[PDB]
Amino acid sequence: SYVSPLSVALGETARISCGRQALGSRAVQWYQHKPGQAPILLIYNNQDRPSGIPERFSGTPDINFGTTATLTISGVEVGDEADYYCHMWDSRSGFSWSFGGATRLTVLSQPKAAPSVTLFPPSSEELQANKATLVCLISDFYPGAVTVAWKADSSPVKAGVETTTPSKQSNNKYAASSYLSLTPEQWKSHKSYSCQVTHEGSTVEKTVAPT
Amino acid sequence: SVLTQSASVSGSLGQSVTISCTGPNSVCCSHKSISWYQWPPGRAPTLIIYEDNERAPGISPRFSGYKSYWSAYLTISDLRPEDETTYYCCSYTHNSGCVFGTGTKVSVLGQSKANPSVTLFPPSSEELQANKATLVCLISDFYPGAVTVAWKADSSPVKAGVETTTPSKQSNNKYAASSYLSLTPEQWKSHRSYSCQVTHEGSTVEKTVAPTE
Amino acid sequence: QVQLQESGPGLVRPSETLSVTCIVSGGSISNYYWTWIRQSPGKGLEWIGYISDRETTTYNPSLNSRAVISRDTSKNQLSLQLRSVTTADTAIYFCATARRGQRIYGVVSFGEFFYYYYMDVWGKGTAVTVSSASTKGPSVFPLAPSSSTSGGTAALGCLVKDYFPEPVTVSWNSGALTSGVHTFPAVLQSSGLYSLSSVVTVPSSSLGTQTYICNVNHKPSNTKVDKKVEPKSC
Amino acid sequence: GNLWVTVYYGVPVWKDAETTLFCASDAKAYEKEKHNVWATHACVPTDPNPQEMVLENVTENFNMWKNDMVEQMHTDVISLWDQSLKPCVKLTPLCVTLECRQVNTTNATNVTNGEEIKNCSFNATTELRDKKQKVYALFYRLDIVPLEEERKGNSSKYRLINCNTSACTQACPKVTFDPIPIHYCAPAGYAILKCNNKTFNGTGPCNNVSTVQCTHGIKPVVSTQLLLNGSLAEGEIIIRSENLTNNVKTIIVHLNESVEIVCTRPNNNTRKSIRIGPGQTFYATGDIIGNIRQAYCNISKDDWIRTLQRVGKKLAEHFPRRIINFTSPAGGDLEITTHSFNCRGEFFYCNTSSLFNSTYNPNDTNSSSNSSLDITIPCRIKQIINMWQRVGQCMYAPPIEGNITCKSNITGLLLVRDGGVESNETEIFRPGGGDMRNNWRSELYKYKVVEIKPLGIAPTRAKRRVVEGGG
Amino acid sequence: GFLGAAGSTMGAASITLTVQARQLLSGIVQQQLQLGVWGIKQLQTRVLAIERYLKDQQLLGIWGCSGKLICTTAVPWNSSWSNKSHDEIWGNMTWMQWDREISNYTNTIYRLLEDSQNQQEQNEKDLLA
Amino acid sequence: EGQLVQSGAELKKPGASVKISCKTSGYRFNFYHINWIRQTAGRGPEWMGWISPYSGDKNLAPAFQDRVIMTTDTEVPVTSFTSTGAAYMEIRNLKFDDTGTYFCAKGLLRDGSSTWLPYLWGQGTLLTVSSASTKGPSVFPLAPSSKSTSGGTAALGCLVKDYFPEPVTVSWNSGALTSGVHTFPAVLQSSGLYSLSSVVTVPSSSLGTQTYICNVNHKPSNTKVDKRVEPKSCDKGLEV
Ligand SMILES: *[C@@H]1O[C@H](CO)[C@@H](O[C@@H]2O[C@H](CO)[C@@H](O[C@@H]3O[C@H](CO[C@H]4O[C@H](CO[C@H]5O[C@H](CO)[C@@H](O)[C@H](O)[C@@H]5O[C@H]5O[C@H](CO)[C@@H](O)[C@H](O)[C@@H]5O)[C@@H](O)[C@H](O[C@H]5O[C@H](CO)[C@@H](O)[C@H](O)[C@@H]5O)[C@@H]4O)[C@@H](O)[C@H](O[C@H]4O[C@H](CO)[C@@H](O)[C@H](O)[C@@H]4O[C@H]4O[C@H](CO)[C@@H](O)[C@H](O)[C@@H]4O[C@H]4O[C@H](CO)[C@@H](O)[C@H](O)[C@@H]4O)[C@@H]3O)[C@H](O)[C@H]2NC(C)=O)[C@H](O)[C@H]1NC(C)=O
Ligand SMILES: *[C@@H]1O[C@H](CO)[C@@H](O[C@@H]2O[C@H](CO)[C@@H](O[C@@H]3O[C@H](CO[C@H]4O[C@H](CO[C@H]5O[C@H](CO)[C@@H](O)[C@H](O)[C@@H]5O)[C@@H](O)[C@H](O[C@H]5O[C@H](CO)[C@@H](O)[C@H](O)[C@@H]5O)[C@@H]4O)[C@@H](O)[C@H](O[C@H]4O[C@H](CO)[C@@H](O)[C@H](O)[C@@H]4O)[C@@H]3O)[C@H](O)[C@H]2NC(C)=O)[C@H](O)[C@H]1NC(C)=O
Ligand SMILES: *[C@@H]1O[C@H](CO)[C@@H](O[C@@H]2O[C@H](CO)[C@@H](O[C@@H]3O[C@H](CO[C@H]4O[C@H](CO)[C@@H](O)[C@H](O[C@H]5O[C@H](CO)[C@@H](O)[C@H](O)[C@@H]5O)[C@@H]4O)[C@@H](O)[C@H](O[C@H]4O[C@H](CO)[C@@H](O)[C@H](O)[C@@H]4O)[C@@H]3O)[C@H](O)[C@H]2NC(C)=O)[C@H](O)[C@H]1NC(C)=O
Ligand SMILES: *[C@@H]1O[C@H](CO)[C@@H](O[C@@H]2O[C@H](CO)[C@@H](O[C@@H]3O[C@H](CO)[C@@H](O)[C@H](O)[C@@H]3O)[C@H](O)[C@H]2NC(C)=O)[C@H](O)[C@H]1NC(C)=O
Ligand SMILES: *[C@@H]1O[C@H](CO)[C@@H](O[C@@H]2O[C@H](CO)[C@@H](O)[C@H](O)[C@H]2NC(C)=O)[C@H](O)[C@H]1NC(C)=O
Ligand SMILES: *[C@@H]1O[C@H](CO)[C@@H](O[C@@H]2O[C@H](CO)[C@@H](O)[C@H](O)[C@H]2NC(C)=O)[C@H](O)[C@H]1NC(C)=O
Ligand SMILES: *[C@@H]1O[C@H](CO)[C@@H](O[C@@H]2O[C@H](CO)[C@@H](O)[C@H](O)[C@H]2NC(C)=O)[C@H](O)[C@H]1NC(C)=O
Ligand SMILES: *[C@@H]1O[C@H](CO)[C@@H](O[C@@H]2O[C@H](CO)[C@@H](O)[C@H](O)[C@H]2NC(C)=O)[C@H](O)[C@H]1NC(C)=O
Ligand SMILES: *[C@@H]1O[C@H](CO)[C@@H](O[C@@H]2O[C@H](CO)[C@@H](O)[C@H](O)[C@H]2NC(C)=O)[C@H](O)[C@H]1NC(C)=O
Ligand SMILES: *[C@@H]1O[C@H](CO)[C@@H](O[C@@H]2O[C@H](CO)[C@@H](O)[C@H](O)[C@H]2NC(C)=O)[C@H](O)[C@H]1NC(C)=O
Ligand SMILES: *[C@@H]1O[C@H](CO)[C@@H](O)[C@H](O)[C@H]1NC(C)=O
Ligand SMILES: *[C@@H]1O[C@H](CO)[C@@H](O)[C@H](O)[C@H]1NC(C)=O
Ligand SMILES: *[C@@H]1O[C@H](CO)[C@@H](O)[C@H](O)[C@H]1NC(C)=O
Ligand SMILES: *[C@@H]1O[C@H](CO)[C@@H](O)[C@H](O)[C@H]1NC(C)=O
Ligand SMILES: *[C@@H]1O[C@H](CO)[C@@H](O)[C@H](O)[C@H]1NC(C)=O
């Protein structure tokens, strides 16, 4: 129906279970899939891993029937945070088309990162096109839990705010952008506009004003 | 044969006869057993007495044995025409083999004499291609077993290539014999008559066939 | 050894024929098996079917009624078609190289062994959406430098406003600029249009006339609009 | 020379008579698992040694086909079977309609068979009479016949195979079927004569003859086509038949060196005890743990093909006919066309088509080593059997937990001629064991029953002091 | 040994006659179980064997040969039974073939055996003692 | 009531060895000894030895102890008290004084004082030791002759001339006519060859319905001569 979660501390070992355990002799596959990228199989035959896959991954064989196929990852890295699929093929159940239910891994104990905020006012060409949008870009923060608020001088805007849900970038940190739609008269009117980004207990605020 | 028997002995028809068989004490019947066999010439012998007195299975009570400390005796009561043959004794222990005797020819006197049956056979035309010419004078059913044969060519005695056989006993208790005259085709074709003369004790018979015939 | 390159339209109307192409380079198509797997938002990845080197098709039971997989002999590329698509078929489509697998657990003469498949090599995957909405070319408005942080560095940007559908590929001077580039995820405004922003952090000293030009490419709308960035003025 | 009859009491004189012998099996102990059908309460422990007395200057007629020890061992096997089936739980209430379904099996794709295990559910009585309980159990297809439909691999309606011919009685879990060494002993006034000729045919006079108080260790092994765990013929490979020219009766083959046959059931099964009455706990087959394989038997192809070669030559001896063609049986009855036997509880039925598929010429007309490619035999399994002839009523072989593996040494064959073809054009042979007694004859050929007559009236040269003689 | 002189001549067989008479019944007194109808055949054999003993003991009972194995009789030998001598019986024939040669009669030899003596002896024992 | 059949007559050169057989039937071969006794023309009977088939016992005479080896095979049973065996006597370095008849005999008793005593003798084996090679016989027809004019009996035969060594076996109609047959002993011709004749006396009326074929067998030379007697006679006494 949906994806099952899991959390493993940084630097420790991760034993990821496989749903619907086999009913006989089995040849399972362990696939690694990060959102937006190509899936990679960590394991293709319980024990075997192709060249290029690190030695930290290992799968339990079926030398004695009754063992649950577990994916063991020794020394969890920040890059190991992804979705893991368990493709189950056994001698009892027939053709197994569907992959296993995804297992969302989350790495705990990561160092927190303060949000880097860059606020950009509506450009001159956009204002010339009778449109305005304040662009508050948040990058390089951890964890991905931020709340964006907008301020005119000191009054909340509360309207016309479009916010992106955070997403992890190449730095293994999170990033999210926030757009505030305004007409050129509203942007030209007030003294200064401010973007407040609340991250953990902190709140980083950046202010821009018309020229 | 150190175990010596009587050379010949005779008894009357319907009477009895005794056969002796003795030898040195190292072989004789002080610590030995005596067996009696009937061994006709040209046949297989037949056990008639075994272990001194007891007779072989199925033997008539006419035969009997009597063993002394120095000799063994075989009595054959009620003599029959088939009893006229040779008999042998054997001195044996439980382990050592038979020690045969010299032999005894038993004659049964007081019987009726028989007439000789003589037939002279000329050499066939196939023998003259060999080439030989042998006259075959056959005699049979005569009694007793003694004859005297003589050949003749054109009423003249012949003494070359004569070969006569000793008398043999027929199954009819009579005797038979044969004589042969070997000749070359010249002597064959050189006379007018060939004759076989069989002479007995009571009657002399002659049969003649011509060579040219 | 083998490299794959997906290529598709990006938007197909409902109840139509979704056609995607997969280009091969390393080896011939008559040497390996080939699988197609789609991944839709809110769900997992779905194996839809595979084709052998012997041109024998096999499909998933749910899509067997609407899926067709083929391979081209002259050109090293395989094709995927899906008739009568709806808004549920919107997904990122991957093609993969499938190797065979023989799992023996008993006597071969009796049988007692089953075949399985694993796909080691994948492609980048092409995102495909399906709806009655029309195409939309992205507007480009450059974000002038703030001239931002303390002495040392500053940030400039390129605004890609109101387009449809995903995705939009952004570069800077056709790849001449690479270090410090960050392309933020687009937002879906309530109008039904996406909007992304790109930023680069360059030193404030290198702002005489280096002229950072941002190149926007959106193949669904055939629009390839570039834009220059100049500092402030006024 | 005066003979008188005299009585001698104890003269070695015997005559052929048929009297009932008795059992004697050497002392074998087990404190936990008791009640051996062929041993416990069926036989008795014997002495440490049954002496064999060689009889000199004796040549004794033997006849294995007119023997009475075989006709006694047959009825003793059947009677021990029915005695084993008396106190156990019977399966009269197991005659309820069955809803059977197919069992999970992965797609396939040479040609072979497959004993479709059926997962059957049914309403069954419980410890209470008025109340019931729907339970499931795994049954082999051969133990069940349908009523309607079948056709889909979905549900339909089924019926146990026995529930009309005769009610069935489950086997006790305590009793064991393993054949134990059984010695047949003769009572007082009788004796057993043993023929010690190594190359002895079926019947006729035997030269080297002895007498014994009891026979040697004979294990009552029941089988078909292949007789195993028996004795080995010393010297030559022996062919024993009541009548070779008779096309109908069988022919027994006694081998000079046994051949290995290894039989395994690879299904790590499970046992599920369900109540079907007060104290009655019917044991059914639980779900098969692990893969779904079929039982089989491996036989060394080198030793088997050499054995069939030598048997082919021994058949070429008694037959100045033509090429010795070997085939499988004609077909029809499953228990006739299969090498059927037991392997600790489970009853195996093997298809020996790959074994009997040879043909050897008198001219030879026209090799090397091939490792040890053991000829594999697909062997199915039955749980409700009615063999031992119809006299022996059925029994539900209770499921055996875990996998099964049993070794065996085949020491002979049970062949049958074909006939119908032109004589000496081509001779055909088919395995089979249509009669139960032939399994015992192959071990009771070297024995005979005799009755002692100690009265001997013989004449001697001696008379008793008749009446008036004392003083 | 038991039946060890079955192929030997009647002279070497008549020596050991206690051996065939021992194992003709000797169910040992043990001095050191049964159940079911299947274990009744055993009993029926025992009884049967016992009868086999107590029948021969009965014949030897009416023949005046109770306690001894060998015994002489007052019945004379008949010439029609066999035409064999002493060395033609006790050193040429086994008890088997001899009993086969006499098997046409015996029953007459048995009637005379219980009639020619013990029917006349017991009559001439009340009239004597 | 057994049966001891010996091998056929044999010719051997001086210095060689020969092995005579003695196959039995109709009795338990292991129950009686096998005796070998020879008879020569000059010395009469002479017991050579006996051998036990059961125990392997052998007793040889001191004269034949140096050049005679006796063996026996194991009996092949037929019934419970009958079997078939064979005995063999191998004699080496033959001389002319060894020429004669050889008999194997079956023992009288199994146990007693005369167990080995020869009782059931065989037909005999004629052994000839000579330097002259074998010579086959020449058979010539003996035409019928008159034996009785009133009784109507004639005598017809066959002449066996020049053969070596002895003997020669004669039959009529392949053994289907042994009544009234008389075979005369062999003569010793001047050249050393043997010759005999076989005659039969038959009614003269049986000429068209009775076959007259004298079967002559000389097995030493491996030759057999089956002759049809010529039924054309020149005797006038018979034609009356
Ligand atoms: C009566 O007679 C009957 C027959 O006549 C007889 O039936 C026999 O039964 C037995 C079992 O009872 C059967 O034995 C089985 O055999 C299976 C197959 O084994 C063969 O193949 C493997 C694999 O070889 C491929 O891979 C290697 C490595 O990549 C390559 O180098 C090879 O070239 C080959 O690759 C080719 O083939 C591929 C397809 O398979 C192609 O894709 C590829 O392109 C290539 O073309 C070999 O390794 C085997 O060799 C081994 O055994 C031989 C002796 O036979 C040794 O000499 C040799 O040194 C090796 O040790 C062999 O050639 C086995 O897979 C099977 O064992 C698995 O299953 C059991 C039960 O489920 C498990 O308990 C067990 O643990 C095994 O699982 C392992 O393997 C799976 C799949 O790989 C893994 O997923 C799993 O995790 C586990 O991994 C283990 O092994 C790994 C190494 O492989 C190791 O790294 C891991 O760490 C882990 O330890 C079983 O043994 C036999 O086949 C039957 N006979 C026949 C003819 O079928 C019956 O018993 C008789 N009855 C009696 C006697 O009573
Ligand atoms: C099965 O049937 C067979 C056949 O029917 C039967 O065998 C017969 O058994 C009987 C005994 O019951 C035998 O008869 C006895 O023979 C005794 C032999 O005496 C000795 O002499 C033998 C000859 O030796 C001579 O030659 C050698 C070498 O040339 C020389 O050195 C000697 O000095 C001598 O000159 C000899 O072969 C024989 O050997 C036997 O015994 C030795 C041990 O002593 C053993 O080593 C051998 O292997 C062999 O077994 C022996 O040494 C004879 O003594 C005996 O006479 C006694 O009894 C009679 C009454 O019966 C008394 O009157 C007499 O005084 C003696 O006390 C008796 O004659 C017969 O020969 C057998 N026949 C055959 C064909 O084998 C089996 O016994 C039967 N078996 C069964 C179980 O039924
Ligand atoms: C032809 O001949 C072959 C050769 O004998 C026959 O093969 C035999 O089959 C029978 C079944 O029909 C087997 O008996 C069963 O064996 C199993 C397996 O466990 C036994 O064997 C193990 C090795 O294979 C052994 O390790 C086991 O225990 C040993 O160690 C313990 C101590 O730890 C010791 O106490 C033992 O004595 C052993 O030394 C064990 O023996 C077993 O599970 C079965 O047990 C059940 O039945 C017995 C009956 O006595 C009972 O006592 C138990 O309580 C339990 O109820 C049973 O013994 C036999 O093992 C096979 N032979 C061999 C050599 O393995 C073949 O069957 C014959 N053919 C035919 C047609 O009969
Ligand atoms: C008739 O059969 C009997 C038995 O079947 C044969 O007796 C057997 O004879 C052999 C040797 O001839 C004996 O073998 C020997 O055994 C001893 C141990 O006792 C051993 O030390 C030797 O090395 C040898 O192996 C065998 O034991 C014996 N049988 C019995 C039961 O004692 C007899 O030989 C046969 N007769 C013929 C003529 O073959
Ligand atoms: C088994 O072999 C025996 C011989 O050892 C056979 O017995 C003889 O067989 C031949 C023909 O082969 C017959 O002529 C004889 O009459 C048989 N003799 C006896 C005493 O039976 C026996 O026939 C063979 N068995 C079979 C079934 O052929
Ligand atoms: C006992 O075994 C021997 C073989 O060791 C048998 O002897 C053979 O018997 C047959 C007749 O059945 C003959 O054709 C053979 O020539 C014999 N061989 C030898 C080597 O003698 C003997 O027959 C057997 N006795 C039986 C079966 O009673
Ligand atoms: C006995 O079996 C052999 C082998 O199965 C038969 O030989 C086969 O004959 C057929 C003719 O119908 C050929 O097509 C096969 O090639 C032969 N087999 C082999 C291995 O060459 C033989 O015909 C059988 N005997 C009879 C009487 O049918
Ligand atoms: C036993 O197995 C053999 C093969 O393992 C079966 O023989 C097959 O029979 C069918 C029809 O009779 C043929 O179409 C196949 O070609 C045969 N197989 C082979 C390998 O020749 C046989 O039928 C089986 N026994 C039973 C009773 O079904
Ligand atoms: C008997 O064995 C022979 C030899 O293996 C089998 O003959 C083969 O049959 C197949 C087709 O059935 C042919 O393709 C092969 O060429 C044959 N020979 C060999 C050497 O494989 C035959 O099928 C077997 N018969 C059975 C099992 O019933
Ligand atoms: C099956 O046969 C094998 C060999 O053919 C038997 O193994 C023998 O066992 C005995 C012990 O009784 C050993 O003395 C031998 O050395 C073994 N043979 C070998 C080659 O090692 C095995 O016992 C037989 N199984 C049975 C009769 O059940
Ligand atoms: C064997 O059977 C044939 C006919 O099938 C019959 O003529 C013969 O007498 C039988 N032989 C025996 C010993 O039963
Ligand atoms: C019989 O067995 C012996 C010894 O094991 C062996 O040498 C011989 O080859 C075998 N012969 C046959 C025909 O089985
Ligand atoms: C086999 O039988 C045929 C006809 O039945 C016959 O012609 C042939 O001679 C026989 N061959 C033998 C007996 O060896
Ligand atoms: C002997 O037996 C015959 C029968 O053959 C009988 O007539 C006769 O009376 C018997 N004699 C005696 C004395 O019993
Ligand atoms: C006694 O032995 C001889 C010679 O072996 C035999 O002919 C005869 O049948 C035997 N039995 C007798 C005479 O009762």
Numbering used by the authors:
A (entry chain L): 6 to 67, 67A, 67B, 67C, 68 to 95, 95A, 95B, 95C, ...
B (entry chain E): 2 to 214
C (entry chain H): 1 to 82, 82A, 82B, 82C, 83 to 100, 100A, 100B, 100C, ...
D (entry chain G): 32 to 140, 147 to 186, 186A, 186B, 186C, 186D, 187 to 309, 312 to 321, ...
E (entry chain B): 521 to 552, 566 to 662
F (entry chain D): 1 to 52, 52A, 53 to 72, 72A, 72B, 72C, 72D, 72E, ...
Authors' account:
Aided by these design advances, we derived the crystal structure of the disulfide-stabilized (I201C-A433C) 16055 NFL TD CC (T569G) trimer in complex with the broadly neutralizing antibodies (bNAbs), PGT124 and 35O22, at 3.9 Å resolution, providing a high-resolution Env structure derived from a subtype C primary isolate. Overall, the structure of 16055 NFL TD CC (T569G) in complex with PGT124 and 35O22 closely resembles those of soluble subtype A BG505 SOSIP.664, subtype G X1193.c1 SOSIP.664, and full-length native subtype B JRFL Env ΔCT Env trimers (Garces et al., 2015, Julien et al., 2013, Lee et al., 2016, Pancera et al., 2014, Stewart-Jones et al., 2016). Another difference in these NFL trimers is the flexible (G4S)2 linker connecting gp120 to gp41 that eliminates the need for furin cleavage (Sharma et al., 2015), for which only the first three glycine residues are visible in the NFL structure. Although residues 553–565 of the gp41 HR1N were not resolved in the 16055 structure, L566, Q567, L568, and G569 downstream of the I559P substitution were interpretable and offer some insights into how the 569 glycine substitution contributed to the generation of stable clade C Env NFL trimers. The helix-disrupting capacity of the T569G mutation disfavors the extension of the HR1C helix, helping HR1N remain in its flexible coil form observed in the SOSIP structures. At least one sugar moiety for 22 glycans was visible in the electron density maps out of the 29 potential N-linked glycosylation sites (PNGS) in the 16055 Env sequence. In the 16055 crystal structure, PGT124 penetrates into a cleft surrounded by glycans N156, N301, and N332. The antibody mostly avoids the N-glycans at residues N156 and N301 but makes contact with N332 and the conserved V3 324G(N/D)IR327 motif as previously demonstrated for PGT124 in the context of a gp120 core (Garces et al., 2014).
